[PDB]
Amino acid sequence: PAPKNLVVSEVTEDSLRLSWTAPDAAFDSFLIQYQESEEAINLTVPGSERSYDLTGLKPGTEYTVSIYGVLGSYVFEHDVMLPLSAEFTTGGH
Numbered sequence: 645p646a647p648k649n650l651v652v653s654e655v656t657e658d659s660l661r662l663s664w665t666a667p668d669a670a671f672d673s674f675l676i677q678y679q680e681s682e683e684a685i686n687l688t689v690p691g692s693e694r695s696y697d698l699t700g701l702k703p704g705t706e707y708t709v710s711i712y713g714v715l716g717s718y719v720f721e722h723d724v725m726l727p728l729s730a731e732f733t734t735g736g737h
Contacts, residue, residue, distance in 0.1 A: 645670050646720070647713050647728045657703040657736035663695040664711055664728065671713035678709040681731055688714070703736035 647666040654661035662676070669691065676687040676696060689696060691714070701707065710729040712719045 645713070646723055647671075647674065647711050650709070650711060650728050650730050652730075652732045654697070655732075655735050657734055658701045659697060659699045660701065660707070660732055660734060661695060661697045662709060662711075662732075665694065666691075666713060671715055673714045675712040675714055675719070676709065677712070678707050681706045681708050701734050703734055706731050706733045 645667060647664050649665040651663050652660050653663065666674075671691040673688050673691050674693060676689065678685055678687075678698065680702070687696070698707075698709070708729070708731055710727040712723055712727055
């Protein structure tokens with residue numbers, strides 16, 4: 645029971661739309677942790693969300709984005725060892 649299929653769309657020079665899949669009402673919320681590949685930011689959103697628009701980013705920059713399904717105050721040990729994770733690069737130069 646995990647979030648799957650992290651994809652990006654609506655890529656611009658300072659924004660990226662993230663999208664993922666998870667089984668209906670399996671998690672209370674998701675933790676989205678991102679930073680430039682190399683200070684990390686933690687976003688939390690309701691468990692019914694399957695997309696988020698990351699804004700305020702730098703042009704031509706690669707980010708590391710991890711999404712963790714949250715039950716109560718917990719994340720699965722498997723999901724910490726192998727999170728839904730990906731690098732994405734903004735538009736521009």
